[PDB]
Each structure stands twice: as C-alpha cells, then as structure tokens.
Amino acid sequence: GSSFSGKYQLQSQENFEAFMKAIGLPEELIQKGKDIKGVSEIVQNGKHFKFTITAGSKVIQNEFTVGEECELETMTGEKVKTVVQLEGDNKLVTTFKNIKSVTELNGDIITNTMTLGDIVFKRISKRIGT
Ligand SMILES: CCCCCCCCCCCCCCCC(=O)O
Ligand SMILES: CCCCCCCCCCCCCCCC(=O)O
C-alpha cells in the first residue's frame, strides 16, 4: 500500500516566519528559507514510511511505522519521540513539542497543517513527476 508515495514541491505556505521563530529556528535560516519551495519525497510501504525534506542545501531524512514509537528530526535538528497515526488512507496525524501536525493527501496535492497554540502553519505542495 503506497497512497502517499511520490515527490511533491511546495506551492505556497502561511505563517512560516511566526512558526519557525516560535520553535527556535535560527533567524538566518528563517530568512533564507521563507521563499524556498522545498521538495518532499515520500516512500510509503504499508505502515512503513520514509520521507526526505529538501530545502536548499539542507536535507532532512525521517522514517516511521504507523502506530509505533518513532524518532523524528524536526527543523531545528531536535529529534523527538512520538507516534504517527493514519486516519484513513490519506491522512497522517502526530503531535510533538505541543505541535499538532496533520498531513493530508488529496490526489496530487498535499496539505500540511502544523498548529502550535494560536499559530497555524499551513503548507500546500503539488506532485512533481515520479
Ligand atoms: C543553509 C541554507 C538555508 C536554507 C535552510 C532553511 C531551512 C528550511 C526548513 C524549513 C522548511 C519547512 C519544512 C517543514 C516540512 C513539514 O511541514 O513537515
Ligand atoms: C520533519 C518534522 C516531522 C513532521 C511530522 C509529520 C510526520 C508525518 C508526515 C510525513 C509526510 C511528510 C510530508 C511533508 C509535506 C510537506 O513538505 O509539507
């Protein structure tokens, strides 16, 4: 099962700066990263996920098995222990550091919503070939 598999590129995002400041991303990376159209590569094999996020020079690789403890490297470099769940074939949900993350695939469009208190950081990405 491979619902999420593919390569997607950011089209637009809301509240990037406010969110990244809140979480402790260095200001130099915030300013150089706010206009980056990052690429996310996902390989789904049943419950087993691997994803690679590229933004400029910076590459972050992560993996998890749905419903199990995993260790996710966040944008700051902090690795967090959490559990990622599926809510249907096309929705991944997790919470770490009081952030709720929801990743939802609709055809070729992935919407990622990260909520930290009143800050709702929304990213919309579009499939880019294979
Ligand atoms: C060293 C060159 C500067 C570029 C590095 C800036 C870091 C950009 C990272 C922010 C992109 C946000 C990715 C989050 C993806 C997600 O929603 O899970
Ligand atoms: C890297 C920080 C951890 C993010 C927590 C969500 C983990 C489950 C989602 C994995 C799919 C990744 C899709 C990212 C799409 C995007 O770039 O906005």
Q: Name the residue ranges covered by the structural domains of the chain.
A: 1-130
Any atom of ligand 2 within 6 Å of the Cβ of 72: yes
Task: Say which experimental method was used.
Answer: X-ray
Work out the burial of residue 34: count CB atoms within 10 Å of its CB; fewer than 13 is exposed, 13-18 middle, 19 or more buried.
Answer: exposed
Distances (CA, A) of 75 to 78, 90, 130: 7, 23, 25
CATH number 2.40.128.20 is the correct assignment for the domain at 1-130: yes
Any atom of ligand 1 within 6 Å of the Cβ of 28: no
Any atom of ligand 2 within 6 Å of the Cβ of 84: yes
User: In Å, what resolution does this model reach?
Assistant: 1.5
Closest protein CA for atom 18 of ligand 1: 112
With vertex at residue 121, the alpha carbon angle to CA 117 and CA 125, rounded to the nearest 5 degrees, is: 155
Residue type for position 49: F
